[model samples]
Structure formats: C-alpha cells, structure tokens
Target chain A: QRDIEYSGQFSKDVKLAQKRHKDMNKLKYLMTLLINNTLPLPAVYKDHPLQSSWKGYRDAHVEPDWILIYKLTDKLLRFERTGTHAALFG
Target chain B: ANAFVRARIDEDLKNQAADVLAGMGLTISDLVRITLTKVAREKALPFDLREPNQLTIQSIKNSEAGVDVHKAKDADDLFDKLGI
Candidate 1:
C-alpha cells in the first residue's frame, strides 16, 4: 500500500490510524467517526498557508488539493467517479 | 394567502452554500433540481436523471468480500498507482 499524505500536518496522524487499524474494518470506521467528530481540521488547515482555504473533507477540496492532501482523497474521489477501476489500478 | 412560505435558515450556512454554488455557476434551485431529477430517474420520471453512482459502494462491498481492493498508497492525483 502506498502512503497517503494529508494536508495541515495531519498526514502522519491519519496514516498512523490507517496503519493501526489496517486489519480492523469496524475500528477503521470508528476511527473515521472519531476523526471527523474530533479533529479540528478547518483550524488545522487554516494554520497552513498551502492548505489554507481547503475544506479537505469534501470531494471538491480533494479535486484541487491532491498534492496537499495526498492520494487518499484523490483515489477515493476517483473510485467514486469511475466506480469501475480496480483499486489495484487506481 | 396562496403564496409559498419561506422559512428561516442560518444566514452563515446560506451564504456559504451560495458562495460555493456561485463558484460552480449554479444556484440552489439548480442544485436541488439536479438532485431531484436524479432521485426520480428509476425508469418512471418525467425528466432524464443521472445513473446512480454505485461503484465506490460496490468496491467497498467487493473488498469486504475478500477482493484484493488493492491498497492505493500515497500519490497525488487519482490516476497514479503503486509501482506505476
């Protein structure tokens, strides 16, 4: 698996969670719940000039900030749009 | 008294949505109609609707079925793949 880099210095933290829960789907879902409910992303993004103005939670934000947010959102969006590409191919 | 009644919503939320829609060259009604049309499509609507987006859910479900669901690692842009 490739590494997904998040914007606003949260990439490591996101990746860590992904790695930690790599085997536990429910835990990963719970992690998403916790992250969405707990992470101060807007504030975090605001702190970084590059990621500033990026509400990285939505598909649109992922469209332009793929570099900043890395491939996670990008691949997710692609998978969503195409729906046919194999994850391996993506 | 037959006029449509409007309810109040958060001004901040309205402005935010409007600003984003404006950027997309669309209005709230446009967005709503687009959604409604798609929702109505199921072979019984008066207007053309978009086909449903079922791929991601399909992929996720397929993955849960023990499909490899290839791990897409860090790499900007959706098209890039590992070892490619």
Candidate 2:
C-alpha cells in the first residue's frame, strides 16, 4: 500500500468520464493496480513517458484515445491531469 | 470547462429510443451518453451484435435503384422524367 495523491483535475476528470459513458470499473481496475505497484507494465499497458514541457511526467493509455497522465513516484503516487490525448502528445 | 460532444445517428433509431426512454427517467440522449462511458470503462462492445441478412437486401434495393436512366444524364432531364 503506497501513499497516493489526487489532484482537483483527477476529481473533475471522473465526472467527465461519467458523461463520456466510461466504465468506472475499468478505471478502478487500473487505478488499483497502479497504487498497488503490481501493475504489469511490460506488455500490459502501452505506457509512454512524457517529454518537452512535461518531460518529467508519464502518461498511460486507458483506452484507444484515452490517457492517464501523472507524475512523482517512488515514495508515493500523484494522480494528475487525465486527458488531452492529443494535447500534450500532439 | 465542460465540452459538449456531438455525433450522428439514424433518425429512425433515435425516434424509437425516444419512445422507450419517454418515462424511463432519463432521455434517450441520456442513455446514449451513459452507454458511451460504459464502453470506455469496459473497453468492449456494450451492445449485442449479431449476423446480417435482411440488411444486405436493403442495400441491394438501393444499389439497384441508384442506376441512372440511360435516356438522359442532365439534372433537368432527370427531373422531367420523374414528372417533377
């Protein structure tokens, strides 16, 4: 069990997901694995680390066009911005 | 800020759903957006899909009728043929 932090955007991202008809269960599934530190990152998630202005961040795809961007780990987990798949990536 | 999403759907299907959701508490559009989120959570097809047959013939009728008249190709001439 690792320490976790959720940004204001993470909370807002959730409500947005509901409107988009996203399955909260899936997000929960991934979120659990993430905080647990047992998430299979090799062939499971297509995680791509960030660069440029977000050079220190890591974002993972929750779906085809969906992304989960967060940062600062090792001692804890910080959940940051949730979307703009094309924003930072673009 | 929140953003409004837009999509296109068949009016026939839209109307049919509107009837069902009339008193279901939420509007037909409500279920649609809800289903969309469910799909993201599930990452799988939310609706039941099956084989196709009657749909093929509907296409056949349309393909057969799209054939233009051999008599005239002009827009005015085509309307004249239809007595419009």
Candidate 3:
C-alpha cells in the first residue's frame, strides 16, 4: 500500500505522460515548475475559515519501496512527477 | 566569502547595459563604482517608486470607456457622427 498524497502525485504523472515526446526547453521548464512545487501550491496550501498556519500541509512517511515507484514514474519518466514537493512529500 | 549566488539571466542584458554606458561615455567599472558609492550613502533601496494613491473601489468602477468602432459603417463616418 502507498502513503502518498495520491491525487497530486497522479496529476503530475499524467502531465509527464502528455509531454512524453516534447523538447528539452519545455521539459526543463516543466521540470522546474514541478521541482519548485509551484503548480499544486495554491490547491494544496489553501486555508479554511479557521485553521492552523500549516493547516493543509500534508507531511507523512511511506514504505521505501512504494516511494521508489512514484519517484521512478515521475522523475525517471518525467510525467506526473513534474511538480516540486509532490515527488518527495507524496 | 560565503557563496551568494545570483539568479540566471541573459548575456544580452549585460551587453545592453554596457552599450548604454558607452553611449554616455562611461565605463562599466565606473558605473559600478558610482552605483556602489550612491548605495553606501543611501543605505536603502535607491528610488521611492511607491504608489502615493492606491486605486479605490470607485476608481475601478469608472475605468475608461471602450467603444466598438465597427458599430459605424466606416472610420470617418464613425468619428464625425458619434463624437465618441
């Protein structure tokens, strides 16, 4: 079983798939956006009416093997994994 | 010195700056020296480019009007008749 922020990790995987045959410039830019955690920051980091500062911040650990699969899918294949913190966090 | 890396930028930007300095008969090094001196004297950001008047709710309400020129048949006829 995986312990990732499943939705976010999946989204990045899809984007990487979309750009499977794209060029280096596009690839580099996409990579930076993913790495910087810029894309999903707004969605993931939203605050409620009354919540702590780190309200929506998701931080958890998972099995090392499960983590490796996600990293390989995103970083290695360069698809759904393009967003920054998602790779490491999820 | 502790490393303080700068953001990546284009070489052409530097060249353009050098060109502007050359046009004013000043060297790049000379510009740096003067800038440094000015910065030391000021001890803060050089310019006060702050907005004195922030836009109010009313300011947004009455933005400049946009018109459709195509409402009239031709350009000359549009201006002559509408007085827009």
| Cα-based TM-score, every candidate | 0.23, 0.45, 0.25
Which residues of candidate 3, in runs, are more than 4 Å off? A1-90, B1-9, B48-84
Model 1 misses residue B28 by how many Å? 0.7
Query: What are the per-residue Cα lDDT tens digits for candidate 3 across B1-84?
Result: 644335455889878988999999997777767866786775432332121122211121221121111122232332233231
Per residue, candidate 2 scores C-alpha lDDT tens digits across A1-90 of 445555444556556776778765666656656766765454444665544243235656666556666554576555555543442233
Cα deviation of A48 in candidate 3 (Å)? 41
Better of 2 and 3 by lDDT: 2
Tens digit per residue, CA lDDT, model 2, B26-47: 8876886888788788674332
**Predicted complex 1: DockQ:** 0.04
Interface RMSD per candidate (angstroms): 15.0, 26.8, 24.1
DockQ values for all predictions?
0.04, 0.01, 0.01
Chain A TM-scores for all candidates read 0.19, 0.79, 0.23
Q: Please give, for every candidate in the order listed, the TM-score of chain B alone compared with the true chain B.
A: 0.40, 0.47, 0.44
Question: What's the C-alpha lDDT at position A71 in model 1?
Answer: 20
Candidate with the larger TM-score of 1 and 2: 2
Expressed as tens digits, the lDDT of each residue in A1-90 for candidate 1 is 223322222223234434544332432332243233433334322212121222222221111112121123322311211111122113
Q: List the residue pairs that clash in candidate 3.
A: A12-A80, A13-A80, A16-A79, A34-A82, A34-A83, A34-A84, A35-A84
Error of 3 at A21 (Å): 53
